[PDB]
Design a protein around this nucleic acid. Sequence first.
RNA 1: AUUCCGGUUGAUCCUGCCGGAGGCCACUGCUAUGGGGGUCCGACUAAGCCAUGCGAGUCAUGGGGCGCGCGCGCGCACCGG
Length: 223
Amino acid sequence: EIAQRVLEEWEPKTKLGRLVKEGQITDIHEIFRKGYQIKEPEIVDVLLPEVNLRENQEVLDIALTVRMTDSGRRIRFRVLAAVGNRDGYVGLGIGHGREVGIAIRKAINYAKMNIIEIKRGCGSWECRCRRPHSIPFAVEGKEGSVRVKLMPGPRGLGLVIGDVGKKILTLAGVQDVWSQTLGETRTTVNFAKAVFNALYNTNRVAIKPEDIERYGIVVGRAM
RNA sequence: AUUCCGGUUGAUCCUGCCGGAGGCCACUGCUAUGGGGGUCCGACUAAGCCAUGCGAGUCAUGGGGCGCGCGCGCGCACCGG
Ligand SMILES: [Zn+2]
């Protein structure tokens, strides 16, 4: 379809982009757990073509900030945006501009560059299935004054959390969760970053080879 | 649904309080077709005052006796329980 449409008019600037364009890197999971740097959004546009669909591109927050000069007030726009494959890959970005379209575009680019993969499972006392509809164990996240704690829930319990957390977890591929919070949750940037870090910290919990089949743990895409 | 949103600045992050948004009880405005079930209706102020009528009686196989009809049968009150 549009693979030859996105790959033909792109000239790589970095070495990872060249590796991807030649064809030696072929799956999304081969770019993560090395010390690789990602400085091109076309890498992710090639390896995850689904992040380009407009239904996977939630725009979260738009703010208008002012800088004083003796002439007048200089206005700037700040846009916090979210991107994600709905099967375990998420990204969060912030973009500034002298107008709104420039800021939105820069936010989506920086969201594509900040892509992470997460782990999923069941882990609940009340469901005990082995299907990756939630997170497999409770996790913590912090940002500024905001603290977030996520806990696994049973099937059909849909996303008991604020709306920013709702959208981020929906772009993550998670469907059931309980939550607790502390701090200035009315500041959208800090709440969003704390939930992002909570989702990241699923990779920081040590597990034994017997837990992967008890909780149905899946790393990245499922099936 | 183990949930958040608005408000102190030229703009920002915090603390902290006020408000919204849910449910139950009492008074109340506008409006109102029909059935069923139920442990609903002068409790909050004055456990303030009350006109009238009803809310506790029964036994004639405990006793004597009066009346009405043919010793018997019906009825009334009295003593007694
Ligand atoms: Zn489950």
